[PDB]
Amino acid sequence: QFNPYGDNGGTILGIAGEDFAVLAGDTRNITDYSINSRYEPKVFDCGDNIVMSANGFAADGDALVKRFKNSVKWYHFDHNDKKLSINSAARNIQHLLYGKRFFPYYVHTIIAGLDEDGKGAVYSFDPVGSYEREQCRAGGAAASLIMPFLDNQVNFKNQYEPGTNGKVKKPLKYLSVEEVIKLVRDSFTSATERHIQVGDGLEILIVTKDGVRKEFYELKRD
C-alpha cells in the first residue's frame, strides 16, 4: 500500500539572544541508509527578518515554507506593505499547519527573528500547529541529543552557585552572538558523532536589526 510520508532526517536548532537570534540546521538530506545530498539547505530567509525551517519530511517541509513565504507576500499586498511581526507570523503558521490537521505536514517547524521590542525571538511548532515562544529549541532527528545540552548551557539548568549548598541557582543572562555560535557548533559536532542522519555541513542564519547574515561550517561526512 502507498505510504505518502517519508523521513529525510537532519536536525535543526534555534537560539535567541538579547538583540539577535540564530537558526541553524545541518545540510545533509537522507533516505533510509543513503545520502541524497551533502548540501541541501533547509533554513530559509522568508523576508521581514524572519528565518524559517521545517524539518522532517522534506516534501512537506518545502511546501510549508513555500506557502509561508507566499503568505508574507500577500500580507504586504493586503495591508499596505506592513512588516509582518514574528508573533503574527507564528499565529499564521499555526493556521497553515492546522489547516491540514487530518492529513498533517510531517515536520518540526522552527522560526526565528526579532520581536517588536527588538529582542531575539524563537518559536517552535509541532506538526499540527501547536506553538510556543522559547529562548532555545532543537528539532529533528538529533533533537533528543542536543536539547538537554542546551538546557544546561543556555538556560543554566541543574547548575548552582559554588559553595551556596545548592541553594542559589546560577543566574540567567543573555549570551553574546560569539558564545551562541560556539554552542551551536559544539551541539552539531556532538550530534554528528552519535547520530548517523546528521553530518556533512552546518549552515547558520543569524538575524539582527541590520539583516540576515549566513555562516557555513564543515561537518564529518561519514
Binding site: K66, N70, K73, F77
Partner: protein, 231 residues
C-alpha cells in the same frame, strides 16, 4: 439607443454600446502616463481628490517584484483585475519557478475582459490600465482597455486630457527611449509629459504619484515627500 441595454447586443452598424460606455468611464478618470527606455519602465499618475479635506485616490498598484500597473476609471474594477494579475504572476512563480512575462500578463487580462462582453447578466470592466514591467526580454509597457484590446507601446497616456501627454511623448520618442541607466532622467521626462495634460492645476507634493521598474530596480512606488525632487 435600442441596442445598449446589455453587452450581449450588437448595434446595426456592429457596435457594442455597453463596451463603449465602459470606455467612456476611462475618459472621465484622472490622467496617467506610461513610458519606458531599454533599461527602465516608468509610470506617472495624477491622483484625484474629493475635496481639500479628503485624501488623493491611489492610482498605482504593485502586482509582483517586477510588474505593476496604473489605473484610470472605476478603481474597484482595477482592484479586481490587479488581484487577478497578482495571482497569475504568483502561479507562474510557484508552479514553474518562472517570472511571468509582461506579454502573457496582457494576454491574460485581454481574455478575462472579453468573457464579460459576450455573456448575458455580466458587464464590461469600467477601467483602463497601464502595465509596466521588466522581464527576460527587457523593459515593457502595456495599455489595457476593457474592450479586451491590449497594446504594447514605448509610451502612452490614458484618462482626461491624455491627448496632450500622448502628443508630447510622440515628439519626444527618440529622446526618452535612449535614457538608459538613468532612472531620474526617465522620470523627469514622464513628469514633463504628464504636465502637458494639466489645466489650472499644477503638480504638488501629495498630488503626484510615480512608479518605476528596471534592470536592477524592483517595482517601487513613490508618493509624498519622495516626489518633491521632481517638481
Amino acid at each position: 439607443n435600442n441596442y445598449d441595454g446589455d453587452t450581449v447586443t450588437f448595434s446595426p452598424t456592429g457596435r457594442l454600446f455597453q463596451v463603449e460606455y465602459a470606455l467612456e468611464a476611462i475618459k472621465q478618470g484622472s490622467v496617467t502616463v506610461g513610458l519606458r527606455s531599454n533599461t527602465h519602465a516608468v509610470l506617472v499618475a495624477l491622483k484625484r481628490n474629493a475635496d481639500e479635506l479628503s485624501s488623493y485616490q491611489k492610482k498605482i498598484i504593485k502586482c509582483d517584484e517586477h510588474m505593476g500597473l496604473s489605473l484610470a476609471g472605476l478603481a474597484p474594477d482595477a482592484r479586481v483585475l490587479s488581484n487577478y494579475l497578482r495571482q497569475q504572476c504568483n502561479y507562474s512563480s510557484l508552479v514553474f519557478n518562472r517570472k511571468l512575462a509582461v506579454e502573457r500578463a496582457g494576454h491574460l487580462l485581454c481574455d478575462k475582459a472579453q468573457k464579460n462582453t459576450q455573456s448575458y447578466g455580466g458587464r464590461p470592466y469600467g477601467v483602463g490600465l497601464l502595465i509596466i514591467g521588466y522581464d527576460k526580454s527587457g523593459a515593457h509597457l502595456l495599455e489595457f482597455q476593457p474592450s479586451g484590446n491590449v497594446t504594447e507601446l514605448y509610451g502612452t497616456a490614458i484618462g482626461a486630457r491624455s491627448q496632450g501627454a500622448k502628443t508630447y511623448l510622440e515628439r519626444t520618442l527618440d529622446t526618452f527611449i535612449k535614457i538608459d541607466g538613468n532612472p531620474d532622467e526617465l522620470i523627469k521626462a514622464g513628469v514633463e509629459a504628464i504636465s502637458q495634460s494639466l489645466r489650472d492645476e499644477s503638480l504638488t507634493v501629495d498630488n503626484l504619484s510615480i512608479a518605476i521598474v528596471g534592470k536592477d530596480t524592483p517595482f517601487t512606488i513613490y508618493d509624498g515627500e519622495a516626489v518633491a525632487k521632481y517638481i
